[PDB]
Design a protein around this ligand. Structure first.
Ligand SMILES: *C(=C)CNC(=O)[C@H](NC(C)=O)[C@@H](C)O
Ligand SMILES: *C(=C)CNC(=O)[C@H](NC(C)=O)[C@@H](C)O
Lengths: 304, 304
């Protein structure tokens, strides 16, 4: 019993973190096989960041200008290329701790663990969600760039995020491991504003299921609703529309608790309309939306 | 910027987790050097748990009755002893991944990371606090016993907790690594009720400092208070008394923000008395008390 904002064990990713220095810029890289992946803004001065031409800045850079340090041992860079907003540095040594891995581009609402790193060294691990506006609400100081987000399926690390940017509002933007930004963001020090940070409705419902499973039941009501009726109220509260696909995904949690998905929608509708009245659910005074249905099943079943 | 409930990177502890089986009971052990530490209730049937005599149950157990598996390789048990509520199993192989480590007994209000494990395998990592009633609010399913709590100082893992028990209220109890329970709890399936779960005042103040550092400032008021005046209001709201020792500990956060500790106490006093009025602080609708002053400094400075 109990339900915690839980990250994946980080060891498999700790074994991939290196330091990348180009001139006076230091950030983190991800060493998988004989490639080190890092944000391409490693080549920029903060002056360059105001309006960088990355192809032009890269002409001035050779293999030997990219200083890669794994623990306190230097890796020899034998190649470099730009792919979208990441640099791939070919090194002469395969990472011996390379886990089974994939690169995935996640959808908004999907959750992942972040291993916050400085100078190629792990500082901490926390759980994030890709917001519907393609930001994440992270904890990232200067030097944290190249920190990665990941999911683990048994022995396979799926890398879904690399940290690049803080917006002036202090929310975070980054790329998949192909170097494509999530959302419309660019690796330039210019005015970039996030869109509406809507609530991930299917995640709130999963977490309400998690609450019922863990004995928190006060909010269960005598009502049901329809997707269309629910969605009219959802829109009013800046909640994402609920689709039949989301209902299908919540099926196993419905089965386990015996609470029809649309019944739990009607409970959520009343919580939105009435508020919490000073009550808590799983120790939160607001509706949590950074647990996926898959996260709730995983934590509630003890997957390793 | 941003402030997250962040755990220590877990890799160093992942390398210590093993499976311990005695008869039909399986749980987790911690392998450090040539010793495996696990809850002594590994020797119990759930029938035994109603009123176990551990010394008598242990007479029936030999080295070869303790099945220790590290990854999918069996360790040879060459010795066993009971220390308080833990068993120490001497194995013929030093754990090659043994980190620098210490055993510490933490105080209430102190935070630590938990690596939740099943069958000696890591499922996830999350941040906890030792509650003032010496429970923790964990996420622990059957099989999670022997999961450990820890802090890391650079390269040294300080192990402070081993999971033993869920109270009927679904809160958690356990021991330090000497096998001494935190609080009055016993490893027996009997009515054990937790005392008052008070709020860790010094931790709330640290987190209010964290909020100011990260741009959340709406709750800063025009008032100050005294420790005695603050404490009269604290007691009314089931907050722990604030001592001069806590004021001293918050000194660096005071210095960094220029907000006198007693000024921040007066802000907290108004938040207790007025509530949040539907507002949030660092994305919480309640006052967070599972960040220590040391945690806020660490996360705000990016220690590795
Ligand atoms: C992103 C991580 C860019 N890197 C930095 O800003 C570095 N800052 C610190 C404090 O490490 C800088 C040395 O390049
Ligand atoms: C504490 C972890 C005691 N262990 C258990 O209850 C085990 N349960 C599961 C599901 O692993 C049992 C096999 O001994």
């Amino acid at each position: 019993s109990g339900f915690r904002k839980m990250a994946f064990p980080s060891g498999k990713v700790e074994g991939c973190m290196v330091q990348v220095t180009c001139g006076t810029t230091t950030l983190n890289g991800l060493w998988l096989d004989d490639v080190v992946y890092c944000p391409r803004h490693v080549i920029c001065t903060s002056e360059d960041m105001l309006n960088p031409n990355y192809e032009d800045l890269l002409i001035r850079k050779s293999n030997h200008n990219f200083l890669v340090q794994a623990g306190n041992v230097q890796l020899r860079v034998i190649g470099h290329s730009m792919q979208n907003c990441v640099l791939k540095l070919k090194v002469d040594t395969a990472n011996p701790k390379t886990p089974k891995y994939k690169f995935v581009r996640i959808q908004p609402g999907q959750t992942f663990s972040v291993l916050a790193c400085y100078n190629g060294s792990p500082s901490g691990v926390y759980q994030c969600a890709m917001r519907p506006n393609f930001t994440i609400k992270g904890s990232f100081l200067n030097g944290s760039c190249g920190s990665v987000g990941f999911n683990i399926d048994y022995d396979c690390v799926s890398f879904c995020y690399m940290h690049h940017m803080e917006l002036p509002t202090g929310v975070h933007a980054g790329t998949d491991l192909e170097g494509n930004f999530y959302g419309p963001f660019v690796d330039r020090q210019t005015a970039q504003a996030a869109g509406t940070d809507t609530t991930i409705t299917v995640n709130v419902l999963a977490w309400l299921y998690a609450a019922v499973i863990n004995g928190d039941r006060w909010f269960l009501n005598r009502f049901t609703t329809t997707l269309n009726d629910f969605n009219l109220v959802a829109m009013k509260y800046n909640y994402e529309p609920l689709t039949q696909d989301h209902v299908d995904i919540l099926g196993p949690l419905s089965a386990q608790t015996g609470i029809a998905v649309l019944d739990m929608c009607a409970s959520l509708k009343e919580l939105l309309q009435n508020g919490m009245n000073g009550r808590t659910i799983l120790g939160s005074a607001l509706l949590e939306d950074e647990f996926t249905p898959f996260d709730v099943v995983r934590q509630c079943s003890g997957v390793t």
